[PDB]
């Protein structure tokens, strides 16, 4: 009665979570599903972990869908035994994975008006950083001043 964890990889672009949940729900009962994505840009690593209610339906689905040429991707659906199953393996299951625009965030995080006291810290971090660079090009024989 224990749940069985199945590892599916070589995922085509388009076979993400809701389509992954939809197809394997035709086999049995899907409890928790989480694809492996990237926190920098939301994008699948072509690898997903699924877990069914029954161990019988986990072995049936993996054996019948193991090598299945889907959109140029010969899949790899294997059964992770309950011996391994890492405890923090579904930390974000059944949750949207939002696409956070960090470069737009950090790009205009620089642009906002800043505190005058912080602008003193800006100068201090500047002059420390210019001074060490003057050191590291003096063995290159270079002096530049500003």
């Amino acid at each position: 009665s224990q749940p069985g964890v199945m590892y599916i990889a070589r995922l085509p672009h388009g076979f993400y979570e809701h389509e992954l949940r939809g197809y394997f729900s035709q086999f049995g009962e899907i409890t928790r599903l989480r694809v492996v994505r990237n926190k920098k840009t939301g994008a699948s690593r072509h690898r997903a972990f699924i877990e069914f209610a029954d161990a019988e339906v986990a072995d049936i689905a993996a054996r019948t869908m193991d090598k299945y040429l889907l959109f140029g991707h010969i899949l790899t659906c294997k059964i992770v035994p309950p011996a391994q199953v890492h405890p923090d393996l579904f930390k974000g299951a059944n949750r949207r994975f939002k696409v956070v625009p960090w470069n737009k965030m950090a790009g205009r995080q620089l642009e906002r008006p800043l505190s005058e006291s912080q602008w003193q810290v800006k100068v201090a971090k500047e002059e420390q950083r210019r001074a060490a660079r003057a050191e590291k090009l003096k063995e290159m024989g270079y002096e530049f001043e500003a």
């Binding site: 193991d66 090598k67 299945y68 040429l69 140029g72 010969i74």
Partner: protein
């Protein structure tokens, strides 16, 4: 796998008698008033076995219903000996449709055009993973029983 095989093979269908005659009338007309080697699907048991023996074939498809079965018994093992990936397919009628005959016992691909070298190598990998791996420890065992 059968559907994905015939997706590539239908792109390499041999010319029919109607359109072969049309092309001959095209080239003869231009002489009254520049091409490369044609890449088709190779057929004919005596032709394909020779292409197997000279290692000129890349993928082989074998009908499962050849009624003197002696014509195809050695053919999986001969492809195994020379290393050419093979797949036993349903329908001697299906292969004949692919090659414009009533029947075809065996169908081979030798070389494909440059626009689809990748999907042939993907189809070959889907045979040595999806078909020939499952056959491996069950092709040497006797069938039936009771």
């Amino acid at each position: 796998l059968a559907a994905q095989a015939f997706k590539l093979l239908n792109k390499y269908r041999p010319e029919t008698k109607q359109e072969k005659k049309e092309r001959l009338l095209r080239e003869a007309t231009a002489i009254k008033e520049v091409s490369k080697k044609p890449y088709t699907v190779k057929y004919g048991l005596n032709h394909v076995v020779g292409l197997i023996e000279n290692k000129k074939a890349s993928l082989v498809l074998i009908a499962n219903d050849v009624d003197p079965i002696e014509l195809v018994v050695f053919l999986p093992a001969l492809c195994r000996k020379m290393g050419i990936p093979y797949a036993i397919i349903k329908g001697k009628a299906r292969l004949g449709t692919l090659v414009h005959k009533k029947t075809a016992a065996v169908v081979a691909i030798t070389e494909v055009r440059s626009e689809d070298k990748n999907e042939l190598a993907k189809l070959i990998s889907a045979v040595k993973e999806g078909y020939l791996e499952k056959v491996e420890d069950t092709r040497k065992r006797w069938g039936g029983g009771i």
